[PDB]
């Protein structure tokens, strides 16, 4: 006769944090494999006491009473479950030993003694015990001492981000030199320390580009990318009028029709070391103005952050060039034969310049005019050439003409 209780395999200690659902599994098996009966009770009662308290801790088993429910391959799962209600304790007294008894099919039931049969402790910790809050990336601030309203708020906003894992009904709170307060749904709390979340806001945006010159071409369309960042990774204004005279320079390009565009000025994270706010100057120089020793704007700009710190005007300037610095001509693919290399006629110029024309389309601008001279050399002119500012290039005679003479007997 089968004589023997089961087994019973459980952990001895299960952590429930309140306000949360718990669960966890008993494992039985019998010398027979059938198990009739699984319990789960208070110490106190009798033998055949089935009285659990409290309420809340509830178990089932699945299959019970089967052949083959119960064997070290198949064993007998129990589920023992519940959620701990929202205001209980979290005190050292807050734990629950249960007893766990056993019975198989013969009638062998599982002995039951105080503090030494199967048995888990159920511990009720608050749910700040289980979560760890991230530190987030610092917030840079006009005073740490006096956060406003929208330092507050970027804070809350920079901890949620770090911190995605923590109950979705967490509530945050930030005092008025930034310290972090996360309330958990049971009421337990986290803080982050003010020297984890804030700081003074004490450097000004950096301009990167600072005493660059951008070399605009007359009569060519030309842009110039101008780069700032910020400690704080956030720039609100970018400004060209700073004082009367960079109000005038900026004014004047303005009246050529340039444009100044800064597409990201309004969003956040828009001026970092690695990813910085660019403004795009875009416009024409035209003709009228000339290059050369005085063909320039000196413009001085300044950028302010969220904490209103505002650099010191920096400089950076557009320098005019002629458009001979850019190109320079292909010569033609064959020379021309000329009668006279002291005189072309008028054929001969106009077979010239069909030649240098057709090596040159691709390379310089298809409003070029080439001017071919009395001795073959060719002359071109670009479309910004000026009296006040000449561009223009020199192909030599050598390149364009072939003597046609005969030679000597
Ligand atoms: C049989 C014998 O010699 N003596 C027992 C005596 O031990 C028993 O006292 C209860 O015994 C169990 C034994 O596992 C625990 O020690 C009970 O204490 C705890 C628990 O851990 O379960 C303490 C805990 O702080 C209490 N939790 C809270 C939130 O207060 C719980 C809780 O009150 C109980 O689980 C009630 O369901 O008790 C200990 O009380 C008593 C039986 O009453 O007397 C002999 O039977
Ligand atoms: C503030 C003070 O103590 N005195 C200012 C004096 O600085 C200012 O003179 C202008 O200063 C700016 C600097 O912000 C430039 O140096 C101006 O010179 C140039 C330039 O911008 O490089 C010279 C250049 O040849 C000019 N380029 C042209 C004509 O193509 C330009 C251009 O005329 C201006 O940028 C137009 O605004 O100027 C220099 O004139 C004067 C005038 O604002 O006011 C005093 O009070
Ligand atoms: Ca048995
Ligand atoms: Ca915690
Ligand atoms: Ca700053
Ligand atoms: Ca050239």
């Given at each position: 006769t089968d004589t023997t209780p089961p087994t019973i395999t459980l952990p001895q200690e299960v952590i429930a944090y309140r306000g949360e659902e718990f669960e966890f599994f008993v494992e039985t098996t019998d010398d027979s494999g059938r198990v009739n009966r699984?319990?789960?009770?208070?110490?106190?009662?009798?033998?055949?006491?089935?009285?659990?308290?409290?309420?809340?801790?509830?178990?089932?088993?699945?299959?019970?009473?089967?052949?083959?429910?119960?064997?070290?391959?198949?064993?007998?799962?129990?589920?023992?479950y519940g959620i701990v209600p929202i205001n209980h304790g979290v005190g050292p007294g807050d734990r629950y030993t249960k007893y766990v008894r056993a019975e198989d099919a013969a009638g062998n039931i599982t002995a039951l003694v105080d503090k030494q049969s199967e048995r888990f402790v159920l511990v009720i910790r608050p749910q700040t015990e289980k979560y760890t809050p991230?530190?987030?990336?610092?917030?840079?601030?006009?005073?740490?001492?006096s956060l406003t309203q929208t330092d507050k708020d970027a804070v809350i906003a920079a901890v949620k981000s770090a911190n995605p894992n923590l109950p979705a009904t967490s509530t945050y709170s930030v005092s008025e030199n930034g310290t972090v307060t996360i309330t958990y749904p049971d009421g337990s709390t986290?803080?982050?320390?003010?020297?984890?979340?804030?700081?003074?806001?004490?450097?000004?945006?950096?301009?990167?580009?600072?005493?660059?010159?951008?070399?605009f071409y007359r009569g060519e369309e030309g842009t110039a990318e101008l780069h700032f960042y910020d400690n704080s990774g956030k720039i609100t204004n970018v400004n060209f009028a700073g004082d009367l005279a960079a109000s005038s320079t900026y004014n004047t390009l303005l009246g050529l029709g340039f444009t100044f565009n800064t597409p990201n000025i309004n969003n956040p994270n828009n001026a970092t070391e690695q990813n910085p706010l660019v403004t795009t100057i875009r416009g024409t120089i035209p003709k009228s103005l000339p290059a050369g020793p005085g063909g320039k704007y000196t413009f001085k700009v300044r950028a302010t952050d969220?904490?209103?710190?505002?650099?010191?005007?920096?400089?950076?300037?557009?320098?005019?060039?002629?458009?001979?610095?850019?190109?320079?001509?292909?010569?033609?693919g064959?020379?021309?034969?000329?009668?006279?290399?002291?005189?072309?006629?008028?054929?001969?110029?106009?077979?010239?310049?069909?030649?240098?024309?057709?090596?040159?389309?691709?390379?310089?601008?298809?409003?070029?005019?080439?001017?071919?001279?009395?001795?073959?050399?060719?002359?071109?002119?670009?479309?910004?050439?000026?009296?006040?500012?000449?561009?223009?290039?020199?192909?030599?005679?050598?390149?364009?003409?072939?003597?046609?003479?005969?030679?000597?007997?």
């Amino acid at each position: 006769t089968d004589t023997t209780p089961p087994t019973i395999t459980l952990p001895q200690e299960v952590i429930a944090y309140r306000g949360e659902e718990f669960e966890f599994f008993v494992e039985t098996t019998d010398d027979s494999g059938r198990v009739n009966r699984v319990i789960v009770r208070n110490i106190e009662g009798a033998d055949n006491s089935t009285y659990l308290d409290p309420n809340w801790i509830r178990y089932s088993t699945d299959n019970l009473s089967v052949p083959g429910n119960a064997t070290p391959a198949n064993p007998l799962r129990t589920r023992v479950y519940g959620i701990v209600p929202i205001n209980h304790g979290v005190g050292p007294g807050d734990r629950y030993t249960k007893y766990v008894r056993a019975e198989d099919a013969a009638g062998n039931i599982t002995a039951l003694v105080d503090k030494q049969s199967e048995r888990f402790v159920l511990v009720i910790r608050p749910q700040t015990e289980k979560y760890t809050p991230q530190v987030p990336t610092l917030t840079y601030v006009q005073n740490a001492n006096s956060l406003t309203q929208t330092d507050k708020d970027a804070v809350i906003a920079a901890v949620k981000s770090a911190n995605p894992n923590l109950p979705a009904t967490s509530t945050y709170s930030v005092s008025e030199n930034g310290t972090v307060t996360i309330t958990y749904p049971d009421g337990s709390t986290d803080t982050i320390a003010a020297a984890q979340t804030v700081d003074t806001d004490r450097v000004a945006p950096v301009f990167v580009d600072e005493g660059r010159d951008y070399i605009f071409y007359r009569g060519e369309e030309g842009t110039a990318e101008l780069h700032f960042y910020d400690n704080s990774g956030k720039i609100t204004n970018v400004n060209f009028a700073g004082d009367l005279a960079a109000s005038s320079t900026y004014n004047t390009l303005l009246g050529l029709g340039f444009t100044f565009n800064t597409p990201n000025i309004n969003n956040p994270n828009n001026a970092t070391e690695q990813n910085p706010l660019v403004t795009t100057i875009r416009g024409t120089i035209p003709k009228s103005l000339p290059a050369g020793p005085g063909g320039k704007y000196t413009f001085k700009v300044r950028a302010t952050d969220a904490s209103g710190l505002t650099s010191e005007a920096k400089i950076f300037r557009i320098v005019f060039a002629n458009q001979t610095d850019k190109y320079t001509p292909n010569n033609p693919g064959s020379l021309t034969g000329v009668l006279n290399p002291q005189q072309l006629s008028t054929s001969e110029k106009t077979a010239i310049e069909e030649k240098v024309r057709a090596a040159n389309t691709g390379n310089l601008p298809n409003n070029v005019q080439y001017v071919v001279n009395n001795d073959g050399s060719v002359t071109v002119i670009y479309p910004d050439d000026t009296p006040a500012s000449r561009s223009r290039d020199t192909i030599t005679a050598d390149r364009t003409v072939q003597d046609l003479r005969p030679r000597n007997s």
